[PDB]
Design a protein around this ligand. Sequence first.
Ligand SMILES: OC[C@H]1O[C@H](O)[C@@H](O)[C@@H](O)[C@@H]1O
Ligand SMILES: OC[C@H]1O[C@H](O)[C@@H](O)[C@@H](O)[C@@H]1O
Lengths: 297, 297
Amino acid sequence: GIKLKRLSDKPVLMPKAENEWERAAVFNTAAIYDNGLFHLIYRATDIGPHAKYGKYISRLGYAVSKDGINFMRLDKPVMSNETEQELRGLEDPRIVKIDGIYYMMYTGFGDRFQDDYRICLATSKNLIDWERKGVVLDEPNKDASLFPEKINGKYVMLHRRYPDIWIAFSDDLKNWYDHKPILKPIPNTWESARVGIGGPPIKTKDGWFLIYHAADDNNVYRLGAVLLDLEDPSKVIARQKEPILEPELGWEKEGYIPNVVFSCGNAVKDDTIYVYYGGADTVIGVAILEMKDIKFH
Amino acid sequence: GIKLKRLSDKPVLMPKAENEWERAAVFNTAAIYDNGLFHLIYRATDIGPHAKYGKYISRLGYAVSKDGINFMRLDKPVMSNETEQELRGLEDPRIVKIDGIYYMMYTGFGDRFQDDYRICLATSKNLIDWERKGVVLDEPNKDASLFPEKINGKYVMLHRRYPDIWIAFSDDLKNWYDHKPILKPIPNTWESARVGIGGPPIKTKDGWFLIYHAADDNNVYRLGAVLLDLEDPSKVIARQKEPILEPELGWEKEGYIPNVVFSCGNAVKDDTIYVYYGGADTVIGVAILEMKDIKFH
Ligand SMILES: OC[C@H]1O[C@H](O)[C@@H](O)[C@@H](O)[C@@H]1O
Ligand SMILES: OC[C@H]1O[C@H](O)[C@@H](O)[C@@H](O)[C@@H]1O
């Protein structure tokens, strides 16, 4: 069934040594198609994003493209480390647009104590000027996004109480209810250690199309695909057995974190899904899936 | 009466050594306030912008700001030299937005023969992806802009048949009529050698507020102010005798072209006009005028 098709044998975005904030790595980017352009809000670090290299700080950059492959980038981050919950920065943003407002969920990494990372919310009208709304769930959690529309009058979010994907609901984004797990790892497979969402889910005639990531027992990260019921997204309609994307190219296999592909963003233009993904926690690539090719056994 | 008030004793944008296309000078920028942000489309050269420095090529960059002083900038130009009319590049853009479309008029400098510079038009929905519409007037001309709305069903443009400011009208942007001069130099003053528009005119209760530039007999460029009738913009209601801005700071007086302030852009936020201007054809500054302070003798 489903396989993502790389648009290039080269990354679409790489670190820039001359800017401290994005000197070492650019990865794990949000992506959205709006007003005739592809927009990336990308994670960037000053040093290799692993504790063995030091106290890396993650910040968020902006890039834009007409074609989804060739990007122009701003010289300064659109969000920087400002709060105590963001001592070590902002990570892995997922963006949806609802009624003219962009809702970005990101991980605020504080590292002040065990499991000091939290899902946080920021909003914008223009993808440049971001207003912090605070922590969303006060618990160790990440890999979160809103659904791109309200379902039955409610905001819906995916999250990740380790090691499973969860869903929850809210009337106002301030308090959440009906938490339940929807997707778990599967033993003795490529998806055995843990799972988490990729980018935000995409609405389809047949259901919500959701890309997810998983790690195996050697911490190799790959992407997979699930389909959720439109009206009750807690119901998994289908889940592909095999991955849709695995580390294959040199810059997916080799980098600060080896053997990783990881998505936080999937932009849609004319029934084609552009999946942006970090390679080896170092660079950003892009692969596509035409909506007509979303087919589960 | 009217004096522009600098927001800073430093430029808001300067050339960038790392990027050849904007290595020498950034100046003469379009400016517009849209969707909560100030946007600049700025002229940039690889080489000092005069024949004495070399065969400079002008290209157009993008910068953005929340506050109108501190800008983030894209790493590549949004328009580059692509046609024969643009052999030496694109200069001095003026932008207005009409019914969701940005209309940029710029000078295409060909330098293939005497007076080979032409007003050209490009349009965009997003300020990044520009569509060329071609030469507007096939004659030696520059310092042109649309009015930011139609007047009595017609597009209106200002232009500059040397050395005077002219106006013309069009049904469709393809053919122009009712050309007439509206503003001339005045002998034995600061505005003796020539005049031309600054940025696009701004609509006011009392008339169209239009900033203009002029050179004196030693080629010192300064800005002035005129008010035009709302319904017939060929009628000058008032013209201030004295300049509203003159080269004063070191980066206005010294640079590739000494003693120049020159505007192609005036963004409006909450009844304040932000006038962006090239200093010495080298850097970009900003000065403001509150609409309540638009008062002519
Ligand atoms: O969220 C905190 C921390 O968690 C993991 O170790 C990785 O995803 C890192 O990139 C991240 O900085
Ligand atoms: O327009 C052609 C040429 O005309 C003048 O010399 C100046 O305004 C230059 O900056 C420009 O390149």
